[PDB]
Design a binder for these strands. Structure first.
Lengths: 55, 51, 143, 88, 218, 150, 129
RNA sequence: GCGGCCCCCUGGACGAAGACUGACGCUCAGGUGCGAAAGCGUGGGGAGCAAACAGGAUUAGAUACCCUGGUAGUCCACGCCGUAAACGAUGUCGACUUGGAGGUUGUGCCCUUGAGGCGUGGCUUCCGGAGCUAACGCGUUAAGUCGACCGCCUGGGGAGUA
RNA sequence: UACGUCG
């Protein structure tokens, strides 16, 4: 949430095809949905997570 | 995106694509860049979602 | 938990007095025995802890099932230190990581978000819990 | 805006003491410091029309305070604009 | 006369700001009526209500919700008084004229029913007519022997029976209501901050009212 | 001692399936001649039924006015829908000198000699409604002295 | 910004009468206490009370005769945009005498009756009807 | 008007406690600045899309809708233009006047005995009370009750034209 | 056309 290197946590908050899950599904108050998404994107730049599942 | 299965399998049963891509996401990107119709389509979509 | 008295009993509906702004109404499904009848009458002081609540006193009908290894369905929702809490019929289950986490060969992320069918062998009505078996792993993993 | 050390230095120079941080000379000098610093910023960029709106608020507010202090004590006015090198 | 025993107020939801003088209002999201305010209010209602009850007046209890029935039939009928316990017809006070001829049909059909020609000429139409006596009997039940429009009105819920309050205010009839924290003191002349939907509370409550209606100097 | 008089009859229409259907509306004001003014609208299919419904509604729904000797007390402004209306007591300012549809309500009201001038709209159905509102919120020196102590 | 505190006071009293308010607080001044003393004297308010030390607060206990409110219509006449200074002959009566008009005369803040009796006109502050 | 992520330079807002100045305020004609899109100038760029244009259809006709192509343009730098249903068709600033359900962002207190309970601010959405309104509706973010200053209106067309 | 009422 605040951190992007913890990709266990980030990998919970992402779907099976690399897409960020909405806060309508996972709860996650909007502040942490914003930190979350921004951390997911920083992780996708570092190739810690994938952008998609067809690379 | 992928599916596989071991030898107990009969039917496709891939409703992973009624989850993400097929129905909405590709039919949406067939037609025009507006900025304008989406602001009102989303306005009346969120104004229709009411009790 | 609330202690109340039965005052009005109109078929399919039972009226219990508690002492709030309204008197609760309990469906006969909670007061019915295994024979197919009732076990109460007007003037009886029964117990009622509040159909998303009648299950707390409806699990008593699942005993004759867990006596012969009754196969049910559940889903993991909680996780702590080696302990997993599964929602089985609304009862927290216990699953140690003896086999859940050991000698990682690959990306073992098929745990948080799994919805399969588990088997039960022993039940504890003294700790209001239901510990899952261990050998049943040959069914939950790859059914 | 401005550095904490810079603001503290200007409050120490222009106030009666520190904690006298709302006096008219002090506010004028802090606005002046920021106006000059952003002269350096807007010599470059030049199409930061949003930040410039903040800058023109600083210019206008400095002007209001100089008009106040001019029609309250003119000796403080002349010493002030003498020291800050404004008025041209 | 006895202190309100068991109701202490209700209605977390849809509470009405005009009930703000009557609310103590603490526990678990629900509002508690200040019963130290209710007791003088309810004693006043017994005062003026006994005052018109001693002038030989008609009172008309109103009890549409459940279980105000048959508690309003029991309390009104324990006195020599009148009641509405099923759906209160829109306009049985303000056009009582037309409701007078419906009451007249109820009298003529019960006189025709238990004494006169009930088995006469048809079975099907006789069944039709008897269930007309069930419909006219449960709708125009208590009011069938009134013969006037009444001198007071005692309603058991102010928001659920707003129609009857609106008509008795339209006609200049004193309205005596047990309001709850959702209700509104519209034109209720003698408001009583209480609990509208507890059967203990309305049987205690109507017990006191029916006690003072027939109270006798003897 | 009832003193009824009609102000306006009109023919309104409805436009059903087969052609139009024409109905008539009356607008009358009754009053005893000493306060006690009412107006009634009433509408029906013929003119005498319309005026009779209008009188019958106007005999009830009758309002008290706190007159002076034979007239108003202080200048009063009553408004209704689009119709703004001034009145001035005109302490024996002889004769009722009001507009149409205001002369009638002031005539049967029992007032004799006021000065009026309706402004705004001067639809007769709303210029009374702006005379009663008006004469209703006009209060007397024994009412103002009742309010404020003395 | 606040540029007419008197009209603000009269606004507080109109909207307090209109909301069945028991009492009305506001910031206080010499002119508001003068007007409030005229209103209590003429019977349009029940009482006033000025409290506070460094920030005074005028409080007007309002009147309600029946269910209706006593102050029927209070208007500000001499607003800051356009000030109105009447002589002792031009000095108006409101509701044909049934309703005072608070005029600030040189002798003090008076009513229309009191200042027409005192023989001196001034600045007409407000109509209370 | 602004939508990947990162850095640099930078504007504003809001909150908590305390300190300081001490009416320094509000509005604003002329004036100045900013101002979507299309358009214009000079120099780049040009994948997609696409006025113009061309072909195919449709049609009575089809200078259109539909199809296949497709140039300016859209993109960048600097300058111009100076407008829009530039719209909450609602000028700015301030004060007062019943409520309910949310959203978003602060902060204080209490067993934090959890995804709590009690308050206190900032911005915002929906519904509604009095009141107002021609009605429709607005409704503490007013179109309610007031004050200050500005802008504008005066039948339709001709004409926002000469 | 067209809406104006009694012993």
């Amino acid at each position: 949430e605040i951190d992007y290197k913890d990709i266990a946590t980030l990998k919970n908050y992402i779907t099976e095809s690399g897409k960020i899950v909405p806060s309508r599904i996972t709860g996650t108050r909007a502040k942490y949905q914003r930190q979350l998404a921004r951390a997911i994107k920083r992780a996708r730049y570092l190739s810690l997570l994938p952008y998609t599942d067809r690379h | 995106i992928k599916v596989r299965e071991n030898e107990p399998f009969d039917v496709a049963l891939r409703r992973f694509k009624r989850s993400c891509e097929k129905a909405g996401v590709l039919a949406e990107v067939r037609r025009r860049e507006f900025y304008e119709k989406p602001t009102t389509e989303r306005k009346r979509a969120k104004a229709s979602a009411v009790k | 938990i609330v202690r109340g008295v039965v005052v009005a009993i109109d078929k399919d509906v039972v009226l219990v007095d508690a002492g709030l702004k309204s008197e609760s109404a309990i469906p006969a499904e909670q007061f019915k025995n295994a024979q197919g009848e009732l076990e109460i009458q007007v003037g009886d002081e029964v117990d009622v802890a509040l159909e998303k609540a009648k299950r707390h006193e409806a699990w008593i009908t699942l005993e004759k099932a867990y006596e012969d290894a009754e196969t049910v369905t559940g889903v993991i929702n909680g996780k702590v230190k080696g302990g997993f809490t599964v929602e089985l019929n609304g009862i927290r289950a216990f699953l140690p990581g003896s086999l859940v986490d050991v000698r990682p060969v690959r990306d073992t992320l098929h745990l948080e978000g799994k919805e399969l069918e588990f088997k039960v062998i022993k039940l504890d009505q003294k700790r209001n819990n239901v510990v899952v078996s261990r050998r049943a792993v040959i069914e939950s993993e790859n059914s | 805006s401005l550095s904490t050390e810079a603001t503290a230095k200007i409050v120490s120079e222009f106030g009666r003491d520190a904690n006298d941080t709302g006096s008219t000379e002090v506010q004028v000098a802090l606005l002046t410091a920021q106006i000059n610093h952003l002269q350096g910023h807007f010599a470059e960029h030049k199409k930061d029309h949003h930040s410039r709106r903040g800058l023109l608020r600083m210019v206008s507010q400095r002007r209001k305070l100089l008009d106040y202090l001019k029609r309250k004590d003119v000796a403080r006015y002349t010493q002030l604009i003498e020291r800050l090198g404004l008025r041209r | 006369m006895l202190k309100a025993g068991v109701h202490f107020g209700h209605q977390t939801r849809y509470w009405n700001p005009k009930m703000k003088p009557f609310i103590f209002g603490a526990r678990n999201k629900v509002h508690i009526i200040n019963l130290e305010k209710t007791v003088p209010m309810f004693n006043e209602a017994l005062a003026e209500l006994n005052k018109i009850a001693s002038r030989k007046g008609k009172i008309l209890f109103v009890g549409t919700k459940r279980a105000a029935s048959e508690a309003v039939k029991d309390a009104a009928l324990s006195c020599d008084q009148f009641f509405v316990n099923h759906r209160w017809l829109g306009g049985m006070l303000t056009n009582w004229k037309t409701v007078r001829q419906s009451i007249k049909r109820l009298k003529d059909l019960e006189t025709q029913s238990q004494d006169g020609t009930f088995d006469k000429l048809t079975k099907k139409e006789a069944l039709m007519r008897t269930r007309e006596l069930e419909k006219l009997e449960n709708s125009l039940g208590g009011i069938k022997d009134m013969g006037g429009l009444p001198d007071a009105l005692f309603v058991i819920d102010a928001d659920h029976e707003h129609i009857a309050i609106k008509e008795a205010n339209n006609l200049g009839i004193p309205v005596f209501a047990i309001v709850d924290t959702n209700s509104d003191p519209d034109g209720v002349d003698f408001v009583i901050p209480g609990n509208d939907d507890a059967i203990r509370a309305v049987t205690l409550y109507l017990g006191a009212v029916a006690a003072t209606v027939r109270e006798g100097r003897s | 001692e009832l003193q009824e008089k009609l102000i306006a009859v009109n023919r309104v229409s409805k436009t059903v399936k087969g052609g139009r259907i024409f109905s008539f509306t009356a607008l009358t004001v009754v009053g005893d001649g000493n306060g006690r003014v009412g107006f009634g609208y009433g509408k029906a299919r013929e003119v005498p039924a319309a005026i009779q419904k209008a009188m019958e509604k106007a005999r009830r729904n009758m309002i008290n006015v706190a007159l002076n000797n034979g007239t108003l007390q202080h200048p009063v402004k009553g408004v209704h829908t689009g119709s703004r209306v001034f009145m001035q007591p005109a302490s024996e300012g002889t004769g009722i000198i009001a507009g149409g549809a205001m002369r009638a309500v002031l005539e049967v009201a029992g007032v004799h000699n006021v000065l009026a001038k309706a402004y705004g709209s001067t639809n007769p159905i709303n210029v009374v409604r702006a005379t009663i509102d008006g004469l209703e919120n006009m209060n007397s020196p024994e009412m103002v002295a009742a309010k404020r102590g003395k | 910004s606040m540029q007419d505190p008197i009209a603000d006071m009269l606004t507080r009293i109109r909207n307090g009468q209109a909301a069945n308010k028991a009492a009305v607080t506001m910031p206080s001044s010499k002119l508001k206490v003068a007007i409030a003393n005229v209103l209590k004297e003429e019977g349009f308010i029940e009482d006033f009370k000025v409290e506070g030390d460094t920030k005074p607060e005028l409080e007007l206990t309002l009147k309600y005769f029946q269910g209706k409110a006593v102050v029927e219509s209070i208007q500000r006449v001499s607003r800051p945009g356009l000030r109105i200074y009447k002589r002792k002959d031009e000095l108006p009566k409101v509701m044909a005498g049934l309703g005072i008009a608070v005029v600030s005369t040189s002798k003090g803040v008076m009513t229309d009756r009191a200042a027409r009796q005192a023989g001196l006109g001034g600045e007409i502050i407000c109509y209370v009807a």
